[PDB]
């Protein structure tokens, strides 16, 4: 049935936090890297920089996020960044076309076969692991902005990230996670009661796949060629010999 006014207020807050995700780049070097007919490893790192900076901006403008200590903020971001990227990758990915279509830049696509340039002995596993995670997030849920926005906040507030040592941080993250999950539960029933329960019960399995896929993604740029000119931020998460 319908959502309470309190839930709607929360969903408004969440809608405002993520409204920065799908918006035009006011940069030209950035829009140039996207509209690029070709994406080598250096270019992929540059594209990631865009989503990551936007991811970090979204975390800052989040009330719940500003309830954690400074040390807790860093640990949450560093630890869930590849996971949130991947989620973001799920939501703009075209299964049949095999490319990523960003809403912020029409006529701009990124080949799924860019993995073919990445670490040789691992690119195949990561390709398969990405389609796996994707295939665990049904269409109806993947197309729902709010639904995926909620899951993005559940992976963000992971009480088990390396570095969350403050008992206070751990407690507040745990509570935030519980509430976000509940919201998603009631939200799912309000938009499609027919099979909300099985849909909600399957997403934790998908989150297990996301973790695993993101985790062995860190070395993907080893053996991929010179990336020295790539943006610096993404290189703090992806190992390089340059």
């Amino acid at each position: 049935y319908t959502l309470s006014e309190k839930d709607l207020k929360e969903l408004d807050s969440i809608r405002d936090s993520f409204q920065c995700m799908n918006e035009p780049l006011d940069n030209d070097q950035q829009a140039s890297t996207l509209a690029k007919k070709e994406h080598n490893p250096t270019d992929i790192l540059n594209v990631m920089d865009i989503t990551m900076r936007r991811l970090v901006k979204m975390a800052k403008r989040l009330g719940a996020f500003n309830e954690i200590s400074e040390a807790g903020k860093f640990s949450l971001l560093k630890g869930g960044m590849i996971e949130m990227l991947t989620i973001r990758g799920v939501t703009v990915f075209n299964a049949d076309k095999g490319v990523w279509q960003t809403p912020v830049d029409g006529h701009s696509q990124i080949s799924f076969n860019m993995f073919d340039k990445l670490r040789p002995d691992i690119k195949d596993t990561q390709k398969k692991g990405f389609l796996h995670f994707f295939n665990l997030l049904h269409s109806d849920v993947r197309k729902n902005d709010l639904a995926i926005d909620i899951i993005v906040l559940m992976v963000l507030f992971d009480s088990k990230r390396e570095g969350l040592v403050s008992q206070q941080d751990k407690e507040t993250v745990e509570k935030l996670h519980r509430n976000y999950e509940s919201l998603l539960h009631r939200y799912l029933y309000s938009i499609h009661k027919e099979e909300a329960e099985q849909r909600f019960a399957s997403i934790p399995k998908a989150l297990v796949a996301l973790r695993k896929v993101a985790e062995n993604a860190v070395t993907l740029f080893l053996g991929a060629g010179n990336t020295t000119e790539a943006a610096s931020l993404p290189k703090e998460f992806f190992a390089t010999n340059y």
Partner: peptide, 10 residues
Amino acid sequence: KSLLQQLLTE
């Protein structure tokens, strides 16, 4: 010291 951290602070 860590662009991530700086992005957080600023």
